[PDB]
């Protein structure tokens, strides 16, 4: 499974790039300018190899402010596959859905997961 967002999203957000790339290490903003955008992708893809099929990934976020066109799941709340299919109108793998529900049970309060995909 994967808990990190897409490579393009990470590149756009400097904070995510530094945090994901290094657990404690920091990355200066000027370094990004020096490196080519294409080059950045090569380094990120090299670490995780190459993938062709789509994968389900979520990220932990803090309670966001008023917004729209977004879906968040309250921590400590059970989440079935039915809700997912209703929210996005698409089917989800049974094994993956079960994993998500299990995660909710052990999920720490105060942490919200964001579910998104590309069609």
């Amino acid at each position: 499974m994967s808990t990190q967002y897409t490579y393009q999203q990470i590149a756009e957000d400097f904070r995510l790039w530094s945090e994901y790339v290094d657990t404690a290490g920091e990355m200066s903003k000027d370094e990004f300018n020096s490196l080519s955008t294409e080059d950045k992708v090569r380094l990120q893809v090299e670490a995780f190899g190459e993938e062709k099929s789509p994968k389900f990934s979520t990220k932990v976020t803090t309670k966001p402010d008023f917004d729209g066109f977004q879906f968040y799941i309250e921590a400590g709340r059970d989440f079935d596959g039915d809700a997912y299919t209703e929210a996005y109108g698409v089917a989800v793998p049974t094994n993956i859905a079960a994993r998500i529900q299990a995660q909710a049970a052990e999920l720490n309060a105060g942490e919200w997961l964001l579910v998104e995909h590309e069609a």
Side-chain angles (χ1 to χ4, degrees):
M1 216 173 204
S2 178
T3 60
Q4 301 95 333
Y5 280 119
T6 63
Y7 298 109
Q8 184 61 248
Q9 291 298 311
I10 292 169
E12 290 173 349
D13 189 71
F14 293 92
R15 181 178 179 179
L16 289 168
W17 185 281
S18 179
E19 290 173 347
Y20 278 25
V21 171
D22 289 346
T23 184
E26 63 183 0
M27 185 66 78
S28 180
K29 66 181 180 180
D30 59 355
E31 290 178 291
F32 289 91
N33 290 119
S34 294
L35 301 176
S36 177
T37 299
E38 182 178 0
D39 186 353
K40 290 177 181 178
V41 171
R42 181 178 179 180
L43 269 70
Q44 290 179 298
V45 69
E46 182 178 0
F48 298 93
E50 301 294 340
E51 301 295 340
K52 305 298 186 296
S53 297
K55 294 181 178 63
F56 181 83
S57 179
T58 62
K59 201 275 246 192
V60 176
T61 59
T62 62
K63 179 173 68 177
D65 65 354
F66 179 78
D67 59 2
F69 299 94
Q70 293 176 349
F71 177 78
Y72 299 92
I73 300 170
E74 183 178 0
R77 181 175 64 188
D78 288 347
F79 181 81
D80 63 357
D82 185 356
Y84 177 81
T85 59
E86 182 178 0
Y88 298 92
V90 299
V92 59
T94 299
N95 290 119
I96 279 89
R99 178 62 174 171
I100 291 169
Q101 183 177 357
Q103 183 181 57
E106 300 294 339
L107 213 150
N108 193 35
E111 291 175 350
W112 288 4
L113 301 177
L114 178 61
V115 179
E116 63 182 0
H117 65 282
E118 181 179 0

